[PDB]
């Protein structure tokens, strides 16, 4: 056919031509053969889309390969390319675009990716806490699409064990002060953080939490693949268990795998009952393909389990499954591999993990605190309430046997009348329930911080 592609530089175009020549040498077509046309990245947004549509569907293409230039934009070519290529329902192939928005196959009608998206890495988090005796997380999250998608995926995957996340704190993107959320998360009992945001936000939260003594002993972190790169690897505290990918910025192997898959799919599809040719011209025909959905369906179910990057197996929504992450620790500003992920399993290596702090142990994920703030109300015969005098105490009474009663300092409001705001005067409360609480606290060895309720209703 006339398969085209869009690449970054001329050398990669030469590599693509060599790969297609090798593929044709391995298996030669009957009469139609296989051509190969390529273009370059011209950044103008609109000009890019016009040029690609003209130069590609003017040549009656069958599938387009689009790659990600090294410009830190994270959207670049795929967004203009995919809309035009999906108007006619021709299928496109992604190479190094890991963003999680293209996984929603409702805006982007036709899109296939070779590398797993960011959100899928969240699955590894679960396996991280499978064999480590960890079941309490306070995971943070951003507010863009990727953060919400990752949080939703983790929540829907954590229901198999009938467990539940503790807190789901989120911060607005591109902020400048995140001390409130960190202060709120400090006063808790879980010691596992699954922070996942953008690089600048990661640096901001690292700097904010450094001053809060959050990087001390027994505070195990867990950090995605974006928060250790380029900039955030400067402020991050020691001991973070960041992840990575093996076959990342390696265009040659990905191109070889993609051309192999495309050639196998086209050879499978060429024998069929009804087949139609692609439209000619950027303008003119406005009718969608009658075979496009069939092409996508036959391309997705392609177990091309022979290549150079391992077995290639897609999934229901058009991603790549069964990847191989390389768990990587940060010891004294020198990233070192300390494990391997091979698919639904983890294999520890012959290296001792150094946790934040510098202890060589298995820090516990729970703390008992033992503060036990307690609410109560003034009924009448159970919990008496009497105002206190300006002496730091309430009173000193006795009983028939002369045994003094037991009192505690009571933090309640004084706004019984409507409209007036609460004064929060530290009054005094004592009685049956207070004595029972005293005995219970003495028996179980803990502490109480009794305080009344605001509204005053039984609930």
């Amino acid at each position: 056919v006339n398969i085209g592609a869009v690449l970054s530089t001329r050398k990669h175009e030469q590599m693509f031509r060599e790969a297609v020549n090798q593929a044709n040498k391995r298996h030669g077509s009957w009469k139609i053969q296989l051509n190969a046309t390529s273009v370059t990245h011209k950044p103008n947004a609109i000009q890019m889309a016009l040029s690609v549509c003209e130069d590609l569907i003017s040549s009656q293409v069958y599938a387009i390969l689009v790659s990600h230039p090294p410009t830190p934009n994270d959207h670049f070519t795929p967004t203009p390319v995919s809309y035009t290529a999906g108007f006619y329902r021709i299928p496109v192939l992604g190479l190094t675009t890991r963003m999680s928005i293209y996984s929603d196959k409702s805006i982007h009608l036709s899109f296939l990716r070779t590398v797993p998206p960011y959100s899928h890495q969240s699955s590894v988090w679960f396996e991280m806490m499978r064999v480590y005796s960890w079941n309490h997380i306070i995971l943070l999250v951003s507010d863009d699409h990727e953060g919400r998608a990752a949080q939703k995926r983790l929540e829907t995957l954590l229901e198999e064990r009938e467990s539940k996340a503790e807190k789901v704190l989120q911060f607005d993107p591109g902020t400048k002060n995140v001390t409130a959320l960190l202060m709120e998360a400090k006063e808790l009992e879980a010691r596992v953080i699954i922070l996942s945001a953008s690089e600048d936000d990661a640096a901001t939260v690292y700097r904010a939490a450094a001053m809060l003594n959050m990087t001390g002993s027994g505070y195990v972190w867990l950090v995605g693949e974006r928060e250790i790169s380029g900039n955030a690897l400067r402020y991050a505290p020691d001991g973070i268990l960041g992840l990575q990918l093996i076959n990342g910025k390696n265009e040659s192997a990905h191109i070889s795998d993609a051309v192999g898959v495309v050639a196998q799919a086209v050879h499978e599809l060429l024998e069929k009952e009804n087949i139609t040719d692609p439209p000619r011209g950027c303008v003119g025909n406005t009718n969608i393909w009658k075979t496009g959905p069939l092409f996508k369906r036959v391309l997705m179910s392609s177990k091309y389990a022979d290549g150079v990057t391992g077995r290639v197996e897609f999934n229901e929504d058009g991603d790549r499954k069964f990847a191989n992450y390389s768990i990587m620790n940060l010891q004294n500003r020198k990233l070192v591999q300390v494990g391997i992920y091979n698919g639904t399993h983890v294999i520890p290596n012959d290296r001792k993990i150094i946790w934040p702090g510098g202890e060589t142990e298995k820090p516990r994920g729970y703390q008992m605190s033992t503060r036990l703030k307690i609410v109560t109300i003034h009924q009448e015969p159970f919990v008496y309430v009497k105002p206190t005098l300006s002496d730091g105490t309430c009173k000193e009474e006795f009983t028939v046997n002369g045994d003094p009663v037991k009192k505690v300092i009571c933090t309640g409001p004084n706004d019984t009348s409507p409209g007036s705001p609460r004064h929060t005067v530290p009054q005094c409360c004592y009685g049956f329930c207070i004595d029972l609480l005293i005995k219970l606290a003495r028996t179980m060895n803990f502490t109480y911080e009794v305080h009344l309720v605001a509204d005053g209703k039984f609930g």
């Epitope: 450094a210 020691d238 004294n332 500003r333 990233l335």
Partner: antibody, heavy 117, light 109 residues
Framework: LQLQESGPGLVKPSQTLSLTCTVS?????????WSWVRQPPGKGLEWIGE???????NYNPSLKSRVTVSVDKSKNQFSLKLTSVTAADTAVYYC?????????????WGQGTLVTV | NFMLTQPHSVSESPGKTVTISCTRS????????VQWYQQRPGSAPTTVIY?????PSGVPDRFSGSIDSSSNSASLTISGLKTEDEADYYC?????????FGGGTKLTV
């Protein structure tokens, strides 16, 4: 917290040379590291490797297959096991401590030796 | 891996203002800040400045570091030249793989 290097002048060629270093006034049971910056004469510097107080090392990737560094708390000292010394090893070897913190910054250095072959 | 350039030396009359600069070949000096080391002749090197913003206790405030963040060239100020500061000055940095040092520089007064 003063460091002193043991091997006075062992300069035997085509052998294994093992300088040893000890620390006075400080205990290795801490959250620090120890490095062996090598100083060629008349040129710049070249970092060699570091060893944590308990279990793991970090060498330079260039000469990553010829240097093994070990520590022992009982005698409170660390030393290397450099093998296959060549004519390019005529450099004075140092013994310097760093501070983990959040920076790679070396503490007060050692006296240094005169091991040149 | 990269390399930091201090070509060979510097020299000026007493009371002048001149200092060498550290140039980084690959990447940019924005993440891994550099440090300046002082090496008196016939003695082990000793630190003179770190992070270009914090100073060791007791060292005179004559030295002051800065980061250009424009052409990957960290700069130093040793204004107030005089005799006793005759020594060698070194520039050291690190990255995700190793830690590297500069070439070398001696000042003449």
């Amino acid at each position: 917290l003063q460091l002193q290097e043991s091997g006075p002048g062992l300069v035997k060629p085509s052998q294994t040379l093992s300088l040893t270093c000890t620390v006075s006034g400080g205990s290795i049971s801490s959250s620090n590291w120890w490095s062996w910056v090598r100083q060629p004469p008349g040129k710049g510097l070249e970092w060699i490797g570091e060893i944590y107080h308990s279990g793991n090392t970090n060498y330079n990737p260039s000469l990553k297959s010829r240097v093994t560094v070990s520590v022992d708390k009982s005698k409170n000292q660390f030393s290397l096991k450099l093998t296959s010394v060549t004519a390019a090893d005529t450099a004075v070897y140092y013994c310097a401590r760093d501070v983990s913190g959040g920076v790679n910054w070396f503490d007060p250095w050692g006296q240094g030796t005169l091991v040149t072959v | 891996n990269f390399m930091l350039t201090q070509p060979h030396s510097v020299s000026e009359s007493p009371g002048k203002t001149v200092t060498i600069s550290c140039t980084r070949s690959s990447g940019s000096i924005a993440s891994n800040y550099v440090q300046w080391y002082q090496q008196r002749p016939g003695s082990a090197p000793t630190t003179v400045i770190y992070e270009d913003n914090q100073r060791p206790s007791g060292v005179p405030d004559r030295f002051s570091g800065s980061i250009d963040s424009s052409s990957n060239s960290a700069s130093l100020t040793i204004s107030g030249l005089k005799t006793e500061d005759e020594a060698d000055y070194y520039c050291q940095s690190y990255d995700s793989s190793t830690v590297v040092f500069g070439g070398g520089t001696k000042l003449t007064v």
